[PDB]
Design a protein around this nucleic acid. Structure first.
Ligand code: BR
Lengths: 15, 18
RNA sequence: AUGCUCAUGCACUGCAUGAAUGCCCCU
RNA sequence: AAGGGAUGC
């Protein structure tokens, strides 16, 4: 659904 | 580029993980 | 498009909370 | 995209 600290954090290290 | 689904064991392990 | 996934909380829907063991082996 | 394993000595 919406971004979360966890998913966001993942996206970062993941980016 | 991969995901991995948390299972009953993985989660159980983590639950016990302090 | 992790803008997920998956648990737990009196519809494969909400809400809230937590987990990168969300591993590693295998079939 | 499905299943199993803590003897995962
Ligand atoms: Br295998």
């Amino acid at each position: 659904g919406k971004p979360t600290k966890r998913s966001q954090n993942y996206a970062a290290l993941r980016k």
